[PDB]
Design a protein around this ligand. Structure first.
Ligand code: 1IT
Ligand code: 1IT
Ligand code: 1IT
Ligand code: FES
Ligand code: FES
Ligand code: FES
Ligand code: FE2
Ligand code: FE2
Ligand code: FE2
Lengths: 433, 180, 433, 180, 180, 433
């Protein structure tokens, strides 16, 4: 059994060591569903996925299927996609518009709020219907993105995010009109632990600046240019959140990274012109030179990952210690030119879908890591997470928070440290910021 | 995407054979990783498309497929297909180095003529069996809707347009590092 | 760990509540194989499956493969389909006729009684052969149906069935000639827990009277008629066994469901004429008006389920907490007209095979439920089993035993209560009637 | 059911092509859920049959398949098929609402002439790939033994008899909500 | 093994059909366990070969397949095949008694002539679906490279050579008790 | 919990009983990876698999992937195929030649000894590279065969092998030129426990002399001959190692099964002529008449199995309690005539590959045994391992060591006894010979 003492020993942020059992152990996974996914804020999508009354999206919170649905009064409700009678899925399609929901098993009927409004033969058989609707989650929106949490005692979304918000606003708060999601959500299955995926977008620019994506950059650069002529971005920074295990990393003053991925038209839109000036104006309060930030990765713990410059967003749905589902979509500025929106759409497919020239190599790596962890000796020794150890500072002139070098694992150590904290501290009294 | 609207008068035996043989030749190039030779078959105006597929109630069945404004698995031009060929033939393209072992089994070939001479709309079913490394097996099934033009090459035809309708919603594979 | 106290907490028949963990927990499943399947009377088939000496059927008791075989003294023996040498399957085909059985591994030879009669090189290598034959099960027949039980201290079949027997007789004791099985055993795999299937046939007319089988009824009614004209049977009763967790439910006087399922010819045979009148005569000692009972479901705990009017019979073979196999066949009266027998064959295939217009929708529901139970929050709140709570009574003038309304969960509460008892009481001294 | 009795002289190029194209057209109707259009192909005397298949020792091999008087997976007339079509096109037919995604890959087409003019006895092989909801995949393989009549419809033929020999004993799928 | 060298000018409609029909007939024999009839198709100089296939980096891609001096899945003459037929038709051959249920789906048939009259080099793709006992399913994909001779038998051809290129490194099946 | 006391009761060599749970229990399997596979000498291949500098083979030790690589100084190194940074597989092909190894994830570079030589951005982000290379295994060779062991406290290979060595020499030490492996490594998956396979080659000639291989022999005998004319060899002996659970069995004089399997050319090469005479002369001092030994099986505990006269060698890689991978190859005398080498190649393919006329029937048996063990009653009673109980002797006039009859289970009892010891004795102080 996993005692709080034993759980604390799994992660050491001071020495920079990780016990590989965290990615493979079945008992730890089952505790994760309770201690981590059962009380964290999880991304379910965007407001534009459910714009009108009755519009729904069927998604997940961990392994719990949920229904996100817009109400008549313009609010958004999130409830468990499970009938409390005998457990049948209430909402059986991916997305659409509903006037009501009905259980296919015994015909228990619900309104779009998830309230139990009709029980067949109730008079002859029965009990209060208001007590027997499916479990409701707390719902909160941050600039278009819809988050949900089961735990009433968990801190609110804003407090939960903390000083990670400036780096989210780089993507979300560029225009007064806000963002909108491009239609369609890509879904695929990777046989690996969610933490490898979450850590990568939290802290791992290192893999993109080294060997993983040499072929991906080759795919993006002009035919006349070869790999030896490709510019190697080395300048940049990394952010670790004060609380929550959130993290971000970005390049500074070197577009070669973004140029290969998103093309010249997107890079021009991101760095030059009226749109880039307005974005820097709106982000003036943070004091960040957002036009100099070119290519960024970010994770909101545990499983909300995005690439602010490229506008790729994904949720990692856990499927046991050895599997995940990747659900991916893309955002654009609501008032962005139709030509720019097409460039974001086409390049996001080209790079980050299941067949994407970047994604292909990520899954290839994670698949083999997980397979290795079936071995006894492969779990017997700690992984090295000592990169950038004691090199981050809280007083950077350009970027707020605990900031270090772009090639570091300070954000990673913070992610695993917070994981450890969520896994070992049952009461929010000690866990909260 | 509804039932392929086949012509009433079926295509001639010669034409039916020519196009079937083209696909078998195309399958041979892909299954033996002749990516440079395969890329040469794609015309400059190529649209290579694989829309997303979603679960929908019959009443909302028109929303099954992603549109041309939505995300997709593939939505490629000649310029972007070139980059993918450069990656797949690259020594540092880890997803396909070591390469996978694939089989494109092709049947259900239906041939339709267009307004343009020597240009054909072709519907066909496939099963793609992908095996890689030690034990990974990914099986794909679907149909392809091609626009083929006659060309002076080893295969006899060139590909002007291709749409792939895969029988999947959530992809059961970790990637789509293969060509359809 | 699962203490008797903790097991008792999983089911509350007084409040009508069910802990969903019972359908998902791996540790509970392992205990089921010992505490439930290891000492319950389980259906293997019919006497007509093995009519002649040496005729065999290879089947299962839980996850233990067994052979059911007719002996030369006309008795039926049941032994484990496992060689005691190194575990090889003795009988390697589905069914047929055997003069003997021989292990393919090392050639240990067995007679049709499962006695070890020859060991190759016995004089050179060796031990008493009479002690080393495969484990034998207790065998008992109830009106054609063959049941088996491993436990020497368990109650006999008659006591085990108790006051459930009159409701079995409705299907089995209509004619002096008895029943016979139609040739063929349908087998398919459903990814759900065995308890969903067992409970449905025990207590759940509700699903067939509401939403699950609307298309099944639509498939069976005349082409001229549409769903809104199909008669909705609302009159009927439900029986809970005094002991054992057995249960049955039936419609009274409203043959709508039976008519759509089995057609006019079978309905007529069941309700009007000499055969129906002889059945009422033979079932006179029960006092039941059997000709008024139009469409019925039943489960003999744990996994013997049938539909007395339609004559479909099923055994649910457990395959972990998340899977079952369904082995299905049908029975007809031995002296029933050939035209009636053909009608029973046709409509059972049309309705209850894997492609059956009813069966399709059952599996669809169950698959979704089991998938839901992977989630933490989906197992955190009890299921509602409160239907008909406190409404059943033991003095119904027409039907004997604990009887309530047709749409109720009293039989279900009894099934789960007995499941709880088998799981928490290791000794038959307290468990037995 | 023994080895199909193929004629020594093979069917003509036109006839072979006609019947192959019929099956490809039929597969397109089924895979695009055109159930009404597909049902029109079945003649009034249709017998649609899928027997059970069992594990038998070589010596008891003649008992592999279930007979006329036994249970089966399908044993259908025009009347019962009508009801099945009503279910599959229904909003309350849960097993196919949301609908599955299927692929009928057809090959190994052998054509045999009968004693009746315009009536052909056809043997073919198939792989049916069925994808359902999020992550369900069911793969079926087997052969079909048809009696096909020449008809004045969109496909060229009507179906008089169909026997499907599925390569399965225990069905690995939870149901058979599809048509073969 | 490189991309099959198909001839520029494709084989005639008649020859294409004759060879395709031969494979369908061969599939029927194998799928219906007519092993004695299938074995008769094998000429006395038969070489029946299925090499091992390994995971190699692109730079070492010349070493993917095992050679003639290496181990293999099958490497057979007429004498050794005869032994295998005696085993598979034997009552004490446990691996195939009870027998498996197999389906050989054949497509992608490309025909190439040789220097010898009535002798053809043929390339085809296959999916072999094997179902065994209660729940065992083994799916195989790959291509076959045959040398076929015209013969006065029931099928029209005899097999002089067969190489099976299987899309597998590690075999996912416990055995290869079937014929390809 | 599995106490040493509980583990000791699983095997009784005095009574000849085996608890079937050893083949199925998940908890026992996890302890096997630690207590058996984590400290045993395990076969990785032959020296000829990695003949030149930089040549590597990707293989396994239990479920740990390892790299076996030939060094410049002719030594062989074995290290874990896992990068210590975040677990990525270092060597991603089956075999070949390398001048270095590089991680595809973050580009950590290694030399062919498995030493970490380069870390990208080490000066900028960092730690000692000499301490962060993949885990090294001990490597030892016995007459061409390469073994590896993780445990630094384990006895050396020679001591581990003990008096089993002369029986290995029957295959390995026939010529001063030694053996060489035919190219190609056959790999396939069997859903059974590794102990069934290891035991079979250890102690089970019984299965080949009875029923399993009747059709295999039938495939090997002349067309004119059938099974009734085929001679049943019954003369032979069995060896149990003094320590370590090693075992061997062989036929004496009667070459019937050797002739059917390998043909007249190999059979003659083994028994008559200059090559056979040299072997008799080279191995005579160990007190073994090698020319009388006609068909042999052997296991070096836990998972190294081979058939000396047939020259088939294999490793059983465990994949949970219910699955193994079989990796097979064949050896020939380096100076064998071209014709003999070809005969060995052809007949090993014919008999022992996945499609082999012997192998086919082996997997068929094992698949059914493992399926049976899913059942509760199937595991409730001991398996019989009483063959040749108290019949073996150490003063045998013809063969060295503890020797009994060919059809016996003394070597098996020795194999499971040692398994029990490894599983219940944590210190080599007690476990060592
Ligand atoms: C995690 C961390 C960095 C990157 C990532 C995911 O996707 C990228 C695409 C281009 C450049 C860096 C990254
Ligand atoms: C369990 C409970 C009721 C029914 C069932 C199974 O199958 C039916 C078919 C028709 C009507 C009721 C039922
Ligand atoms: C284990 C034990 C004996 C044999 C074996 C494996 O393969 C054989 C092949 C021929 C004769 C005996 C054996
Ligand atoms: S499960 Fe929803 S009504 Fe019974
Ligand atoms: S397993 Fe039955 S004789 Fe050995
Ligand atoms: S895992 Fe090998 S370098 Fe990061
Ligand atoms: Fe990446
Ligand atoms: Fe039902
Ligand atoms: Fe064997």
């Amino acid at each position: 059994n996993w005692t709080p003492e034993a759980i604390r020993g799994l992660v050491d942020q001071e020495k920079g060591l990780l016990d590989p059992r965290i990615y493979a152990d079945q008992s730890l996974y089952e505790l994760e569903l309770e201690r981590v996914f059962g009380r964290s804020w999880l991304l379910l999508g965007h407001e534009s996925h459910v714009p009108e009354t009755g519009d729904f999206l069927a998604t997940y919170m961990g392994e719990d299927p949920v229904v996100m649905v817009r109400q008549k009064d313009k609010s958004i409700k999130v409830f468990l996609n499970q009938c409390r009678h005998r457990g049948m899925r209430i909402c059986r399609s991916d997305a659409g518009n509903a006037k009501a929901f009905t259980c296919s098993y015994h015909g228990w009927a619900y309104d779009i709020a998830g309230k139990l409004v009709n029980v067949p033969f109730e008079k002859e058989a029965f009990f209060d219907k208001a007590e027997w609707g499916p479990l409701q989650a707390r719902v909160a929106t941050y600039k278009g993105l819809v988050f949900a949490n089961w735990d009433v005692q968990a801190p609110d979304l804003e407090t939960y995010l903390g000083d990670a918000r400036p780096y989210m606003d780089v993507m979300l708060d560029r225009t007064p009109a806000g963002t909108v999601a491009i239609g369609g959500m890509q879904k695929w299955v990777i046989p690996c632990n969610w933490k490898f995926a979450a850590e990568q977008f939290c802290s791992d620019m290192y893999h993109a600046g080294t060997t993983t994506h040499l072929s991906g950059i080759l795919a993006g650069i002009p035919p006349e240019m070869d790999l030896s002529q490709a510019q190697i971005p080395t300048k940049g920074n990394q952010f670790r959140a004060a609380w929550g295990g959130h993290g971000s990393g970005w390049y500074v003053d070197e577009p070669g990274s973004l140029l290969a991925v998103m093309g010249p038209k997107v890079t021009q839109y991101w760095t030059e012109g009226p749109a880039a000036e307005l974005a820097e104006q709106r982000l003036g309060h943070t004091g960040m030179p957002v036009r100099r930030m070119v290519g960024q990765h970010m994770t909101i713990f545990p499983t909300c990952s995005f690439l602010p410059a490229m506008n790729q967003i994904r949720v990692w749905h856990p499927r046991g210690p050895n599997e995940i589902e990747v659900w991916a979509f893309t955002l654009v500025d609501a008032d962005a030119p139709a030509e720019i929106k097409e460039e974001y759409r086409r390049h996001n497919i080209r790079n980050f879908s299941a067949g994407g020239v970047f994604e292909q190599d990520d899954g290839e790596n994670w698949v083999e890591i997980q397979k290795g962890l079936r071995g006894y000796k492969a779990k017997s020794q700690p992984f090295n997470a000592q990169m950038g150890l004691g090199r981050s500072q809280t007083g950077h002139p350009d970027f707020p928070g605990n900031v270090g070098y772009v090639y570091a694992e300070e954000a990673a150590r913070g992610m695993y440290h917070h994981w450890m904290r969520m896994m070992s501290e049952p009461s929010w009294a000690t866990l909260k910021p | 995407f509804k039932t392929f609207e086949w012509p009433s008068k079926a295509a001639g035996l010669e034409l039916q054979n020519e196009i079937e043989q083209f696909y078998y030749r195309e399958a041979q190039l892909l299954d033996h990783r002749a990516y440079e030779a395969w890329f040469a078959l794609l015309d400059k105006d190529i649209h290579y498309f694989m829309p997303l597929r979603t679960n929908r109630m019959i009443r909302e069945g028109e929303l099954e497929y992603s549109g041309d404004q939505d995300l997709a698995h593939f939505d490629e031009t000649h310029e972007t297909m070139y980059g993918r060929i450069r990656k797949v033939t690259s020594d540092v393209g880890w997803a396909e180095n070591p390469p996978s072992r694939t089989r494109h089994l092709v049947s259900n070939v239906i041939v339709k003529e267009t307004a343009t001479p020597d240009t054909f709309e072709v519907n066909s079913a496939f099963i793609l069996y992908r095996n890689r490394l030690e034990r990974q097996v990914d099986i794909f099934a679907g149909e392809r809707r091609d626009v083929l033009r006659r060309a002076d090459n080893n295969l006899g035809f060139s590909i002007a347009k291709r749409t792939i309708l895969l029988d999947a919603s959530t992809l059961l594979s970790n990637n789509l590092s293969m060509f359809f």
